[PDB]
Amino acid sequence: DLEGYGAISRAMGGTSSSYYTGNAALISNPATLSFAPDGNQFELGLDVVTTDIKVHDSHGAEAKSSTGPYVGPQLSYVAQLDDWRFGAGLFVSSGLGTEYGSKSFLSQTENGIQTSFDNSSRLIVLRAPIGFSYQATSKLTFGASVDLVWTSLNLELLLPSSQVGALTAQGNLSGGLVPSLAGFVGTGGAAHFSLSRNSTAGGAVDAVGWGGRLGLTYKLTDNTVLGAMYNFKTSVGDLEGKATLSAISGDGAVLPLDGDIRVKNFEMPASLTLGLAHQFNERWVVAADIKRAYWGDVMDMNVAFISQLGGIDVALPHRYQDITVASIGTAYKYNNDLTLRAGYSYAQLILPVIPAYLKRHVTFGGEYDFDKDSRINLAISFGLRERVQTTEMLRQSHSQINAVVSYSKNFHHH
């Protein structure tokens, strides 16, 4: 989440508690949809998430990922029935995606042998919300919305023998496949996990579930409105699909094995958000928001792989603490049809294929509308780059850019 939804909400540091954010409010604060211009709003957009990562060896070897992006489409329509606003939409998004290739050290056996396995990641989450909004009384504005989330997980991951040995020795790695493959992998081999299938027959690790939120707004003054919204815990099942567990010996021998894999217990925590937007002049508006993701309340993960020959189970325990986000955003009416936006956000061990989220983000946004019904919104969010290190004694450097773009046509009732 953190960064909100939509070209304007993202160009404004992820702020969204109480100002027109567009059709994307269907996920953030649907109560803001009542601030929409008279009529019905059709919205179309594209999300692109560039990622730059460099991981280094204890020998000066590097594996980098960034070396063409995933583009997520965004369709949605909001309708006005008197005081009501009803809206539906499909919101595609990545939430992980790395590609280190197969010529890197991450693809070598605890031993030095260069295997040909890739090392990559890709998480895709679709959100198709159904929601409404009621302007209950000129002052407050009710707003609810249910979801339906579709998650897909692509994985390509090699673990040199020392890593499996410690998992195994820690008791975090179990299964009947331990005693049968252990001799093959040995001292200088590894194990590779692959989740490469797509869609449906394909296998493809995915899950479908529900989700939802509700919020509200209030205008104490004539240019200062306040907002808040509560998000429900994502009730997603286990991600399940086909996976190939493949053992590699000290001389590069490969012993693949197809089966089922389940990535158990993970949802997405409930979040509480409080904020306020204020207009100074009349062409300049400023917004500040404070978000609280209840990660710490996720006590309820694993990875269960199972085949005809046996299975392997990995028990990797979180250690989660609620996170807090502080965001501020600016919008400026520079022309009669050109707005300028900008903002900042503030958040608060390794594994190169699943990078941790970034602490800070600096965004820029712009709006240009040809008519009073046709608008184009742009946004560019930079996830500030942070360094961080841990045989495999690694060090990682990770930054991230974000482009969102959408065309917004306003229709009129006849």
Ligand SMILES: CCCCCCCCOCCOCCOCCOCCO
């Ligand atoms: C996916 C299964 C991963 C399980 C592999 C565990 C591998 C861990 O290390 C085992 C190391 O011990 C084995 C020794 O090397 C083989 C030598 O031959 C032994 C008899 O003298």
Ligand SMILES: CCCCCCCCOCCOCCOCCOCCO
């Ligand atoms: C909401 C995002 C959830 C995304 C989860 C993707 C990460 C889940 O685990 C993927 C690993 O399962 C396959 C391999 O076996 C585990 C590897 O050993 C662990 C590293 O220390």
